[PDB]
């Protein structure tokens, strides 16, 4: 409840400052500008490597999501099984990284 008050206050202060920033110099009548970039009008070429690093982020972020309950999982009574599955998950993250390595997926953004 106080959390929603805080979030709403931060959004309100940000919207206040952004509106004042967009509209305090719009009181000025400075001049009207016509103003008739590295690329001129060429279409943005698709970069395959940027997409590959975004999907590699997404899959390793999912493996992170599996890793996230480990401080609570260390409190279990089945510690041998828990330690085995934790080492197996971090090892599978390392194997996904090794396959991403050796198949040249981490190249030109290495």
Ligand X SMILES: CCCCCCCCCCCCCCCCCC(=O)OC[C@H](COP(=O)(O)OCCN)OC(=O)CCCCCCCCCCCCCCCCC
HSE-up of residue 31 (Cα within 13 Å, Cβ side): 3
Residue 99 touches ligand X, criterion: CB under 6 A: no
Query: Measured from the CB atom, is 80 or 102 closer to ligand X?
Result: 102
* Through-space distance between the first and last CA atoms of the chain, rounded to whole angstroms: 45
Binding residue for other proteins (CB under 8 A) from 48, 102, 103, 108? Answer: 108
Q: How many Å apart are CA 48 and CA 106, to the nearest integer?
A: 12
Mark residues 24-53: x for contact with other proteins by CB under 8 A, - for none. Answer: xxx-x-xx-x-x-xxx--x-x--x-xx--x
Of residues 5-44, those binding ligand PC1 (CB under 6 A): 24, 27-31
């Amino acid at each position: 409840m106080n959390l929603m008050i805080t979030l709403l206050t931060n959004f309100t202060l940000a919207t206040l400052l952004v509106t004042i920033a967009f509209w305090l110099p719009q009181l000025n009548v400075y001049s009207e500008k016509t103003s008739p970039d590295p690329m001129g009008s060429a279409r943005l070429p698709f970069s395959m490597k940027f997409f590959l690093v975004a999907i590699t982020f997404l899959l390793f972020d999912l493996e992170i999501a599996l890793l996230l309950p480990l401080p609570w999982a260390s409190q279990t009574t089945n510690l041998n099984t828990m330690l085995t599955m934790a080492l197996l998950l971090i090892f599978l993250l390392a194997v996904s990284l090794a396959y991403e390595w050796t198949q040249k997926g981490l190249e030109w953004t290495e």
